[PDB]
């Protein structure tokens, strides 16, 4: 086993601590939530008597039954299940109506008030494992009638997607905006959470090396991958209506491009780092029709993956890419002329989540016997960073052109990084609302034209790379292979 | 074993090659030079009919005896091509300054380039002067007198440090082999330029976008180039007295490491282009002025294991010879002006290393003390390596400003390939006459000043790293300790 050592600061020792999880039945309440929460509990990252809040329409068994059956790093940890527990509550009430949050607001008050401690005034974070529908109900509903006590503050953690398009995500930002500004709304795209991602900011602007490197004067192309080697496995019905663009590209991917691309913060303020990929997100111009490849899957050729259109879920005639290859044009100073490619595909040869930042040719005096210096930045499956360069050949040469490529090598859940950095009051890693915007409005044309049949996704075999098209689009756009 | 695959070029196979080693009986010889002919006839780099005439004045009835017992004691890697190997080996008695010693030479070598299977009997010479420096003007001057090719052939001369002992000296040895041999016929060996990671340094400045960009004042704070040895003089300090360690590894080793590291961009990747470089950017340093250097001489290791440099009976008392140097250099050039350079060598120091040390500027904004200089180093001893020193995110979960230090690290004999080069006529990893000359230049005043005795060496301890002073005149030149 291993003894509690509490990292949290002092000033969180302050006043009582609430977290409410509504939608606590749910599946993501307890396959991400909770067992991030216990996670977190382990590292001492929760102040000491902090009370957590199960929250569903759906008490001691189900604590036993139902949440651990999902937690992880029993084997080692297994020895803080029950202190943890000590501080759940169950709460059975609906999401969307005013009087079940006043009795919440008395429950938790009769929580606040067994806090050690004068301060009864606790600060309450909110988080919305429910369906995106809910969200404006549960949001003017904790308004009415659960704000904290003078003293303390109110978070609200609401996950993507929000809207399918720049209207619908626009309205339910609109309808969210009566009830909390942008200070108290933390709106979670995960891939934020991931140790690669956050990495970026400090690989580029802590370091000489890479910041002195990272503009168009040494940049000839930069490309953002995710790929995996299933399908949609038989829930092709839910993914016939997202699209492989607006399940990866437009949110995740898009962020990882804003890390990679905006201008450095004068600090690390949050909203001075938020402030600069909002100003990246507004120099790209909309994805137009002539800057992708899309496609669609078929049957794996040894039978083991079948086809997208066979899934009976799935509408005949789709036009639904499961593959997708963009080219973006970021018209700043930084990078302009460079591409920008996206690339996601379900069904494909691996398994991977990559960046690589090609750069340009030292054209002399080497010649062709130098190739293109490329950074890598890979996430999954096994995370790695690595520069590739030209090095002379090693043993006896006959001359100094006699060269090889080689390498410098680089020698937690998501949840668990963005739950304590809201109850730290972070939102570094936490989507803005003008954010999201222009982030819908680079995709949102491209995706009605896709929607319309504007945009016919070419066939490809389960297991194979994708469309040849997308290989040569890539070449074109100034990537050499 | 192995089998011995031939990577000779036709264009080599076409007349005789004779290799004529000079000194054959001194130590270079036997513990380099033939060692090094051995690897390269087991690698399949000499033509399969070389002959390899060995040269010295010591007479040895049973050329066989000398063969067995002297030569393959330190030939390495052994052992199934020993023997055919010695069959190439010939042993010729003579003086090294004697015009007749060596027409008698040019008929035994006549004799063997007669023996060539092949229409073609002119072959090409090589000399290599395993001598002391004395008899470097001797022996080229009987070689131009008794023992040059027929037409076809031609003949290149190997010539082993050192070269002078300053700029004055250095120019009349250069000067009285003028009329002997003219550049394109002359290879200076400074053996570090066969070193693997000294011939890579061009290709990972040129060939890469990534160091191009990099590689100036711009984003360099301070640039260092060190020798560590633990051993010290071993009794023969009394030869080591009249050199000093500035002549024994930095005017000369060092320096062609500073030139590699420094020097813009050649035009081709020509012997001559490279060379061009080096010449002009060593022409853009000023001499080292005495207080811009700190001085050690090694003493007794407070263990006993490594005993005191001056308790040597080799070595004069009053002695004031370094044993220990740091120096700083600056670069007048657009690429480097304000970058410190920092020439460090020593023996008797507490590991064995050379290294290159690059300290990048900090990124000042927006993590401040949360970061630290970049570094690029790139080391050839003990081990080979070169990686990048850089600043991360603090594995695990975190605010931003907990960060830590990671690394991103790279996944022969010198005079092996110095020869190999030598047969081929690639002069790139040589020294150039009007090179040895500026890089006498920038060392020689400060030489002339410790001569004189007018900087004194101050004492350190075997084993430690050497004088505090020494560490001290590093942190005021703009480095900072990681
Ligand atoms: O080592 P490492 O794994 O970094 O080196 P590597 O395997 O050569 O990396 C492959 C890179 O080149 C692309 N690529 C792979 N096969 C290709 C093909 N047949 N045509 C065009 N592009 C191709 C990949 O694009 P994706 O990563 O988009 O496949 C990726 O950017
Ligand atoms: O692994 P790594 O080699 O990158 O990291 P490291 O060994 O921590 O870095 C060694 C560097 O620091 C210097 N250094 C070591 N001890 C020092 C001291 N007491 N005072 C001042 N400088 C000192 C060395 O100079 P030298 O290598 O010139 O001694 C070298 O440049």
Redesign the interface.
């Given at each position: 086993c291993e003894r509690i050592v509490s990292?949290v600061s002092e000033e969180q020792k302050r006043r009582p601590l609430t977290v409410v999880v509504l939608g606590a039945s749910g599946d993501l309440a307890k396959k991400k939530t909770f067992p991030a929460l216990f996670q977190?509990y382990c590292?001492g990252?929760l102040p000491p008597q902090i009370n957590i809040v199960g929250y569903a329409r759906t008490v001691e068994k189900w604590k036993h039954e139902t949440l651990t059956k999902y937690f992880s790093r029993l084997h080692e940890r297994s020895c803080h299940v029950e202190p943890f527990l000590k501080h759940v509550t169950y709460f059975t009430g609906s999401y969307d109506k005013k009087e079940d949050f006043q009795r919440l607001d008395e429950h938790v008050s009769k929580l606040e008030d067994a806090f050690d401690g004068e301060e009864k005034a606790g600060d309450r974070l909110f988080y919305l494992a429910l369906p995106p529908s809910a969200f404006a109900g549960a949001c003017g509903s904790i308004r009415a009638g659960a704000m904290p006590r003078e003293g303390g503050w109110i978070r609200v953690i609401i996950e993507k997607p929000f809207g399918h398009d720049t209207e619908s995500s626009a309205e339910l930002s609109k309808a969210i905006e009566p009830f909390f500004d942008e200070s108290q709304i933390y709106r979670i795209d995960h891939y934020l959470g991931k140790?690669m991602v956050?990495?970026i900011?400090?690989?580029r602007?802590?370091?000489?090396?890479?910041?002195?490197?990272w503009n168009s004067?040494?940049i000839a192309c930069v490309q953002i991958t995710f790929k995996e080697t299933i399908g949609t496995e038989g829930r092709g019905g839910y993914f016939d209506s997202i699209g492989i663009i607006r399940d990866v590209m437009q949110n995740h991917l898009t962020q990882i491009l804003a890390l990679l691309a905006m201008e450095?913060?004068?600090?690390?303020d949050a909203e001075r780092i938020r402030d600069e990929k909002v100003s990246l997100l507004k120099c790209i111009a909309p994805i137009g029709k002539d800057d992708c490849v899309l496609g669609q899957y078929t049957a794996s050729a040894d039978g083991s993956i079948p086809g997208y259109l066979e899934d009976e879920t799935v509408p005949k005639g789709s036009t639904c890419p499961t593959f997708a290859v963009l080219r973006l044009h970021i018209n700043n100073d930084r990078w302009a002329g460079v591409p920008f490619i996206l690339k996601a595909g379900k069904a494909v040869e691996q398994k991977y989540v990559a960046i690589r930042i090609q750069?340009?040719?030292?054209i002399?005096?080497?010649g062709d016997?130098?190739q293109?210096?490329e950074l890598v930045i890979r996430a999954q499956p096994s995370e790695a960073?690595?520069?590739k360069?030209?090095?002379?050949m090693?043993?006896?040469n006959?001359?100094?052109?006699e060269?090889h490529q080689?390498?410098?090598?680089?020698?937690?859940d998501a949840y668990?990084?963005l739950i304590?950095d809201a109850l730290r009051g972070?939102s570094?890693n936490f989507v803005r609302k003008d954010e999201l915007d222009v982030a819908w409005r680079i995709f949102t044309p491209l995706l009605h034209q896709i929607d319309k049949g504007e945009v016919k996704p070419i066939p490809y075999q389960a297991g194979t790379r994708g469309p040849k098209e997308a290989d040569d689009f890539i070449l074109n756009s100034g990537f050499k292979f």
């Open positions: 990292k977190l590292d990252l140790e956050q990495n900011i400090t690989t602007f802590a370091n000489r090396i890479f910041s002195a490197l004067n040494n450095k913060p004068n600090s690390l750069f340009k040719d030292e002399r005096p080497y016997a130098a293109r210096n960073m690595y520069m360069i030209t090095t002379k090693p043993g006896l006959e001359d100094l052109r060269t080689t390498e410098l090598d680089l020698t937690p668990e990084s304590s972070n570094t």
